[model samples]
Target: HWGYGKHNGPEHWHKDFPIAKGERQSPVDIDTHTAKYDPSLKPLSVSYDQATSLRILNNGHAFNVEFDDSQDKAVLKGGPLDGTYRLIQFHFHWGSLDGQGSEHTVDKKKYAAELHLVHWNTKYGDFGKAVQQPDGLAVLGIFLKVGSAKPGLQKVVDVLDSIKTKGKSADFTNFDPRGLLPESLDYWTYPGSLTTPPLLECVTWIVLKEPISVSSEQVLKFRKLNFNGEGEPEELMVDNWRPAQPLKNRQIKASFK
Candidate 1:
């Protein structure tokens, strides 16, 4: 089920996910002039809790919205994280073309979509043993610009036609993914993995360098979703993303000048 265009994408996912050529894979490419300004990074501390949010799925690759991490209610304290993580899900990644769908890219360009707010790591108490350790996940890379018109992203584009295919789902409650953040939490950490599949290197990413707008008809309705379902043969889910990796000897910390 690996679909991202052309013969099972992401360079054929390392011929069956050999950590997709490891070295900490993920949507990397944020070379803000070799990024590194940690000045003691801190000051992120999100909270959430719009009743811990609820549903919104599609799972053909992207559409997540789940949340309710059971206990932390919804967390993610401080920038590069150290303890609490929680905040279970939130997703997006685009590109069937429109300035090209984002999967972490800055100097290399591309950004008409990308928003994944996943988290997990109550010190690795869950999220499948916290993505098999190594600092167990923290992802939070917004960046989805098109122009204007973001009435808080029309509550996730009014639920995207009830999840337009694949495993389809709806519910989507209170909706407060920090109102699509970007008052500048200023970020850009490193160490990655999980741009999809079991490509788990544990993740600590945290991108966001202020970018929050979405229009082009709310980003072309995420390319009308549906990587084949309902009648099977409808592809269209558009460049599901994943093609930046390779920071190898990583070191990209920057929390603000």
Candidate 2:
């Protein structure tokens, strides 16, 4: 029942999902001045298989591209990870306007959008099991600014019309998620929770410092999604992001100087 509306938005989530008030909640502001450089941090090793991509769907919350995680064909390792994490899915969070949308901010600055590549630790058996452990999930956060259109992202944009309503999905295969990443893997890592309901504190957040670009026209395509299912009153799916939470006692380690 949680949504990005005045009646059921982020602020109202804590009432049902009490962990929303817990420490280590996600989307924290990154004060670069205070982020300590971890010289020991290794460069991230990301390998994704084009064949692992399965489908894209409108889950009412956000449009997500699901993957086949049955094998280690697509995964993430190194750079603050203890073991290999399998890619499960990828999704985005955006706002109605380009001025503000990204969940995480640097120096209190917001971007037009944010992309999340969701993965789970291999040692945890499966995504369901991983979600219950402290070292379970590892999410790659990439910020998106308004600029020249990104061809990699364009593959995703071109399919929006087919899944315009909630619960609608289409087969989206042969997609290489690697194409969607920034040239640099420089990032800030910290312990955090899922930005959505249940707010589980099991994620090791890897937020990319460098942002990729997106055209304004492509962004409008995201707004074309309806939060409501078929036969229901239509509602635009925008501002589907939780505001940055308190940093608390967690320290953010930078992979770059």
RMSD of 2: 0.9
Q: List the residue pairs that clash in candidate 2.
A: none
Clashing pairs in 1: 94-101, 215-218
* Residue-by-residue lDDT tens digits, candidate 2, 22-63: 988998999999999999898899987543888999999999
- C-alpha positional error of residue 62 in candidate 1 after TM-score superposition, expressed in Å: 4.7
lDDT string, candidate 1, 43-89, tens digits: 88888754366898898888888877888777887876888888788
Which candidate number would show the highest TM-score if scored against the true structure?
Answer: 2
TM-score of each candidate structure, all chains considered together: 0.34, 0.98
Query: How high a TM-score does candidate 1 get?
Result: 0.34
Q: Give the TM-score of candidate 2.
A: 0.98
Top candidate when judged by lDDT against the true structure: 2
lDDT, model 2, position 94: 95
